[PDB]
Each structure stands twice: as structure tokens, then as C-alpha cells.
């Protein structure tokens, strides 16, 4: 919990009354994604084999 | 009376027309803009890594190998970020 | 009148202008 | 490789100043409204480039100039003609089939670059004439006498590039960029209308065309030149070779600053040299 | 949506949005004044996308002391509430020791999204310096 | 007073990369103590206001 999270910041079990900066939120990537041109006239291997 | 009223009517004139003063408060914001655009900025820069980019370089050396890259971009932004800090420190100390 | 990408972010006053402005 | 006979007449290289052309863009990058401040190669402002001229008189004497050019690190070329004269260009080292050499030709409409260790004559040329008295067409014989030993080959861009006509001045203002970076030949061009005489004073961004990835040395470099079996100006009688006039002229890239300006739409619209 | 992106070798992370940007038709993705990647080209589609850095903030924990009581008031910075409850639902938020919202906590300052602390219309002198004029105290 | 800022040295020098950060650890509380002294330095221009 914060409270918690507080207390390992300070490095302590007290916590007197005020405002600390604890850490840093972000908002996680759901999915990842790739785009790429196109196959681009692949090779012949057909052809040979 | 009359003296101050047209001494008070002067004042809207003679704060931006004749520069000279309101310049700090000015110098102060672009001050500030200068220093964290140069901060992000910084991390533009090889340091004489392979690449500026922790993506690039993870994606074309091994790790061994990688961790001396990874470590030099580290090292470059870290000196950016203590920079910035100190800079930041002694301006406050101007400003208080 | 006149970075928030990467790790920097601007803290607003504790006194807005309207309070500045209140007090002068 | 057949040669006509002519009245040569050696090739005069003018020396004038280059203005502020050859700025190109360095990389695929969109900015608006910036001003990016970039080491490159590039051509320095008012520098000081040569000047070659391609034309066949009316007194018999035809202008048959075929110099050699080195290439050091890049290559500025300017072109100015109503008949397309230069058709391409050759890059290479000993242009011979002991090493492998780059050569690029415009045929009408189509454009052709290989890589190959031709074998080039004194003076190749392409054949530029008349098949059946009614059809224009080209013929590479007089270029190379045999290609062997290729390792790329490209035929594309089927564009006649100058098409929409001589109302000002030819609209013919070729202007082209050739670098050759960590293995990559890399042409950049520009046309634009000539607006007077000759090399206008104005700026503008050459765009990037094509990019090869040949990867082998160049250290030499020469154009190419076409003649037509007469049948060229009207009222002449002289049944011989005769070619339009043309000029070119030719710059080098040196390693520079500039401070591009792109404007809102990403294009860049002004530039200062930082040791003008 | 705040997704992993990698377009022909350039990888990043972000949310990509529909642009009104126009490039060259060489150009293939965008730099900032400071050289940061904002737009990008999709190789296929040749759509032109902005790229927006997936919502990020300080975190502060007001306290009335751990002897006082042991409740806490969560201050996200520069963010508003509806992006974080948002990504509350989604489980997207880096800490993942989400307080408890009642309706009636969540409190828009313009520091930020403060959450367990009910706003109060009257103004008293300030105790805990929140922000923008916001101040926070443990009071009935 | 002057712009009141903060840093997150993860986010700035080794941001959304797992190998990065993991050798940032080695470097200590190099990196509390630049927080500290932004965080020193906007309290006092709440002061200074
Ligand atoms: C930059 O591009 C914009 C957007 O296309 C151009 O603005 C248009 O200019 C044309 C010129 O014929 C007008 O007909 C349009 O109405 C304009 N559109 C808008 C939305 O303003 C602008 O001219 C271009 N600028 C330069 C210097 O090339
Ligand atoms: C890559 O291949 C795709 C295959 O779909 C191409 O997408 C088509 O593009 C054309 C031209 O704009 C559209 O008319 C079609 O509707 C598209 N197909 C689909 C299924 O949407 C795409 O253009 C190709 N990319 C390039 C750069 O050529
Ligand atoms: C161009 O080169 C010629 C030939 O040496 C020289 O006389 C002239 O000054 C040069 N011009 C410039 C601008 O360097
Ligand atoms: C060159 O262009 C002409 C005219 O279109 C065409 O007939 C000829 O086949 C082309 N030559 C080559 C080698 O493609
Ligand atoms: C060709 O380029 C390579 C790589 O730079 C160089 O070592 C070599 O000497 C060059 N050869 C010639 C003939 O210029
Ligand atoms: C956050 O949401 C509020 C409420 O809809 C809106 O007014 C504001 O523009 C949004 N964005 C920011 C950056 O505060």
C-alpha cells in the first residue's frame, strides 16, 4: 500500500505528517505491435527446387 | 497629484518600450527552458556507444559485449543528469 | 511568456497567480 | 565501338560560382519549422565549380568533349539542354572489366543501372538515331563491347522526366547529388525551371531519389553523350552527326556545416554555411 | 492506445493517433526540435500517425503521521482522473497498490488526480502543501 | 522564484528497459540524491514565494 511503500522509501516504520515523493506511475503497454513495407518480390527458391 | 498621475501613466510605457529592466524575469523562463531542452537533448548522443538508442543496442551485439554500450550511455546520461542537477542548485541559490 | 517526454515533468506553484494576485 | 570522324575541338572548362544551390536533404527526417544544424557533405556556398559545353556548330565543327572527372567523396552535377544530351554516367575505379563498375543510362523513357565489369572503349557513346526513317530509338553498342561479371542489376522508372515543354527556358535545370556512404550510392535530384539564362539565383532542397546498396569503391566518374544521324535542324543539308546544345557544369562536396530551415510542411527553404 | 511499436527498425512505445502532419513523400518519420520521434509513417497503409508517450507521473503519499492515523491520500502528478481510472480498469497503472476510489474520493487539482481525500468547500490555512493552491489536512 | 522540476533518473537514463536499470543499480543512490536535491529545490521556491 502506500503507506508501506512510504515507510521503505524513508527507511523507516514512523512516518511524520506531510507530502513525500514516493515513486514514479506509468501506464503499461497492453499489446505490441510491427509494421513492416511488404514482401517486396521475394526470391525465386520455386524455381531452383 | 497631477505630478504622480502622470508619473503612474508613464509607468505602462516605460516597463516593456525601454527594455532595460523586466528582462530577468524573461531570462529566468528561458533559462529554465534552455536547461531541460539540453537535458533531453542529451539523450541524443552516442558517448561513444554504438548507439544512442538502448533498443539498438540491445538488438545487435550479445550481452557481454553489450554491457560495455549499455554502460557508456549510462555513464553519459548520468553526468547529463548531475549537470543539470548542479546547474539547477546554484541558480536556486541566485534566485533565494 | 515563452521535455515532458523523457522523465522530466514541471511541478505547478504552491500559490497560483490568483493568490499572488490576491495578496499584492 | 565506332567513332565518326570529326573536327574535335578540346573541351573548355569555364570556372563560375555556384551561388547557393546544392543543398539536399541529409536524411528521411520530417521537421517543422526547425532549424537543424547538421554536419555533412555538402557543397559550400558560393563555391566554384567547373563548366563544360556540348554543341555542334553550323561552320562543320562539332564540340566533341568527353573529359575525365575524379570523384573524391561527392559529386555536384548541373545540367542544362533541349534534348536531353546527357543520358547518364559512369562510376568507377579503373573503368575496365578488371574491377566491377556502376553504370547508369536514361533510354527514352526507362532508366537502366547495373553493376558489371564492363568493358569500355576510348569514347563510349550510345547510338541515338533512326529505325525505319519514322521511329527514334537507342542503341548500346558504342558504350560497352561486353558486360561480364555482374552483381546487380535495376531497370525501372519508366518517366520521360522533362515533359511539359520549352515555355521559359527548357524547364531543364537537372540537378543531381551523388554520394557513396559506408557501402551505399546514394542520388539525390532535383528539376527546376530556368527562369533567364542561365544558373538562376535561388534556393532549392534536392530531394533523395534512389538509393543502391553496391558497397564497392568509386573513385572515378564521367557522363555520357549521344549524336543523331542528322535530321536535327531544320534547312540543313549536311548529312553528319550532330548534337543540341547543352552545358553542365560539375562541383565536389566538401565536409560541412549548414543550418537547414525547414518550414512548417518539412520542406527546407533556406540554409547558412557556418564558415562562409 | 499505449502500445509497443516497431516500424521498419524503429522501436518505441506510445499511443499513435490519426495526424493532420503532412510529410514529404520520402520522408519517413518525424523528429522533434529535440530529436524525438513524434510522427511516423505506416510502411504499408502510408498513413501518418503521431506518436503521444504513454501517460507517466510522480507519485506523493500525503500522510497525517503514522502516529496520528494510518490512512494515506494519493496524489498522481500532472495526470487527470479520468486516465487513471481508466487505466485502473485495464490493470495498466506501474504501482499496483490501487486506493480505494468511493466516488466520492477522487478529486481532480490541477497538480493532478488526488485520491483519498474529499474536498471540502470551505478554506482554512494551509497544512499540506498538495499544490496550486490545494492544500490537504486530517481534520472531521 | 523559478520553474519547480523533477526527474526520474529510470524514466531519463534507462527508460522502459529492464537490462539498463538492472545495471543502474550498481551505481547506488546516485540517483536518490538528485531527487533530493530537486525536490530541496522547489520547496524553497514555495518558500521563496
Ligand atoms: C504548406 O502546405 C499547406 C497545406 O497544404 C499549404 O496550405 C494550402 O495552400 C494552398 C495553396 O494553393 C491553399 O489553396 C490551401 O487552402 C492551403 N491550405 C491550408 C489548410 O491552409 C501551404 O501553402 C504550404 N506552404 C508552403 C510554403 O508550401
Ligand atoms: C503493401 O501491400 C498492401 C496489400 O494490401 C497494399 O495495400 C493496398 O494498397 C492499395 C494502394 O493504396 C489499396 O488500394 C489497397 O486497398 C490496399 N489493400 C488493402 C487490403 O488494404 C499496400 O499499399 C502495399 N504497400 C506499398 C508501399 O506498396
Ligand atoms: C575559382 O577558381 C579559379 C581558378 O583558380 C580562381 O581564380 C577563382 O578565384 C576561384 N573562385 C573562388 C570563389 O574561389
Ligand atoms: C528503349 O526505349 C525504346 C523506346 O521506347 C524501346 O523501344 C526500347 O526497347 C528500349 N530499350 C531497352 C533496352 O529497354
Ligand atoms: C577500396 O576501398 C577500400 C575500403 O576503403 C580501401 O581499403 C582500398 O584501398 C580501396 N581501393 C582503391 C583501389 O582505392
Ligand atoms: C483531463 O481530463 C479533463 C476532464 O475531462 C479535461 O478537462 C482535460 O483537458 C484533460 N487533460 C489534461 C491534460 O488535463
Redesign the pocket.
Given at each position: 500500500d502506500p503507506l508501506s511503500e512510504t515507510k521503505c522509501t524513508l527507511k523507516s516504520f514512523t512516518v511524520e505528517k506531510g507530502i513525500y515523493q514516493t515513486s514514479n506511475f506509468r501506464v503499461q503497454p497492453t499489446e505490441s505491435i510491427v509494421r513492416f513495407?511488404?514482401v517486396t518480390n521475394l526470391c525465386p527458391f520455386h524455381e531452383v527446387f | 497629484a497631477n505630478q504622480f498621475n502622470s508619473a503612474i501613466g508613464k509607468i505602462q510605457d516605460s516597463l516593456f518600450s525601454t527594455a532595460s529592466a523586466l528582462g530577468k524575469l524573461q531570462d529566468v523562463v528561458n533559462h529554465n527552458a534552455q536547461a531541460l531542452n539540453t537535458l533531453v537533448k542529451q539523450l541524443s548522443s552516442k558517448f561513444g556507444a554504438i548507439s544512442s538508442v538502448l533498443n539498438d543496442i540491445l538488438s545487435r551485439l550479445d550481452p557481454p559485449e553489450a554491457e560495455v554500450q549499455i554502460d557508456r550511455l549510462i555513464t553519459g546520461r548520468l553526468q547529463s543528469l548531475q549537470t543539470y542537477v548542479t546547474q539547477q542548485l546554484i541558480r536556486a541559490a541566485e534566485i533565494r | 511568456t515563452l521535455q515532458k517526454f523523457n522523465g522530466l515533468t514541471v511541478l505547478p506553484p504552491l500559490l497560483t497567480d490568483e493568490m499572488i494576485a490576491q495578496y499584492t | 565501338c565506332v567513332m565518326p570522324l570529326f573536327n574535335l575541338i578540346t573541351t573548355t572548362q569555364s570556372y563560375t560560382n555556384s551561388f547557393t544551390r546544392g543543398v539536399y536533404y541529409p536524411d528521411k527526417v520530417f521537421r517543422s519549422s526547425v532549424l537543424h544544424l547538421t554536419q555533412d557533405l555538402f557543397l559550400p556556398f558560393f563555391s566554384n565549380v567547373t563548366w563544360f559545353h556540348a554543341i555542334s556548330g553550323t561552320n562543320g565543327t562539332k564540340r566533341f568533349d568527353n573529359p575525365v572527372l575524379p570523384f573524391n567523396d561527392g559529386v555536384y552535377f548541373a545540367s542544362t539542354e533541349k534534348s536531353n544530351i546527357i543520358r547518364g554516367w559512369i562510376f568507377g575505379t579503373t573503368l575496365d572489366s578488371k574491377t566491377q563498375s556502376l553504370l547508369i543510362v536514361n533510354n527514352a523513357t526507362n532508366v537502366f543501372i547495373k553493376v558489371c565489369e564492363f568493358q569500355f572503349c576510348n569514347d563510349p557513346f550510345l547510338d541515338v538515331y533512326h529505325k525505319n526513317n519514322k521511329s527514334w530509338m537507342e542503341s548500346e553498342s558504342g558504350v560497352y563491347s561486353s558486360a561480364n561479371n555482374c552483381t546487380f542489376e535495376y531497370v525501372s522508372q519508366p518517366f520521360l522526366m522533362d515533359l511539359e515543354g520549352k515555355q521559359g527556358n527548357f524547364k531543364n535545370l537537372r540537378e543531381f547529388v551523388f554520394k557513396n556512404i559506408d557501402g551505399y550510392f546514394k542520388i539525390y535530384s532535383k528539376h527546376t525551371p530556368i527562369i533567364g539564362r542561365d544558373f538562376p539565383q535561388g534556393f532549392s532542397a534536392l530531394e533523395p531519389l534512389v538509393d543502391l546498396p553496391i558497397g564497392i569503391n568509386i573513385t572515378r566518374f564521367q557522363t555520357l553523350l549521344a549524336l543523331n544521324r542528322s535530321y536535327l535542324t531544320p534547312g540543313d543539308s549536311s548529312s553528319g552527326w550532330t548534337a543540341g546544345a547543352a552545358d553542365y557544369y560539375v562541383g565536389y562536396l566538401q565536409p560541412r556545416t549548414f543550418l537547414l530551415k525547414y518550414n512548417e510542411n518539412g520542406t527546407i527553404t533556406d540554409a547558412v554555411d557556418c564558415a562562409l | 492506445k499505449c502500445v509497443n511499436f516497431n516500424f521498419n527498425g524503429l522501436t518505441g512505445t506510445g499511443v499513435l493517433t490519426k495526424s493532420n502532419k503532412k510529410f514529404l513523400p520520402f520522408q519517413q518519420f518525424g523528429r522533434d526540435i529535440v530529436d524525438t520521434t513524434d510522427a511516423v509513417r505506416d510502411?504499408?497503409?502510408?498513413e501518418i500517425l503521431d506518436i503521444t508517450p504513454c501517460s507517466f507521473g510522480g507519485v506523493s503519499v500525503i500522510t497525517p503521521g503514522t502516529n496520528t492515523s494510518n490512512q494515506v491520500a494519493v496524489l498522481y502528478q500532472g495526470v487527470n482522473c479520468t486516465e487513471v481510472s481508466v487505466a485502473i480498469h485495464a490493470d495498466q497503472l506501474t504501482p499496483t497498490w490501487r486506493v480505494y476510489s468511493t466516488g466520492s474520493n477522487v478529486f481532480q487539482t490541477r497538480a493532478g488526480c488526488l485520491i483519498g481525500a474529499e474536498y471540502v468547500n470551505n478554506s482554512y490555512e494551509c497544512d499540506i502543501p498538495i499544490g496550486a493552491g490545494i492544500c490537504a489536512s486530517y481534520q472531521t | 522564484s523559478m520553474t519547480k522540476t523533477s526527474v526520474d533518473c529510470t524514466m531519463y537514463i534507462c527508460g522502459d528497459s529492464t537490462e539498463c536499470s538492472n545495471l543502474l543499480l550498481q551505481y547506488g543512490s546516485f540517483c536518490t540524491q538528485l531527487k533530493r536535491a530537486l525536490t530541496g529545490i522547489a520547496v524553497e521556491q514555495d518558500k521563496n514565494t
Open positions: 513495407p511488404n | - | - | - | 510502411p504499408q497503409t502510408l | -
